[PDB]
Amino acid sequence: XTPRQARAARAAXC
């Protein structure tokens, strides 16, 4: 995946 999941992944340096 969702937009929310993607934002979290991006913030965690995926």
Ligand X SMILES: *Cc1cccc(-c2cccc(C*)c2)c1
- Binding residues vs its own copies (CB under 8 A): 2-6, 8-14
Q: How far is CA 4 from CA 7, 12, 14, in A?
A: 5, 13, 14
What number of chain residues touch ligand X (CB under 6 A)? 7
Distance of closest approach, residue 11 Cβ to its own copies, in angstroms: 7
Query: What is the distance between the alpha carbons of residues 9 and 1, in angstroms, rounded to a whole number?
Result: 10
Name the binder of 4 from its own copies, ligand X, none, CB < 5-8 A by kind.
Answer: its own copies
Positions in 1-14 near ligand X (CB under 6 A): 5-6, 8-9, 12-14
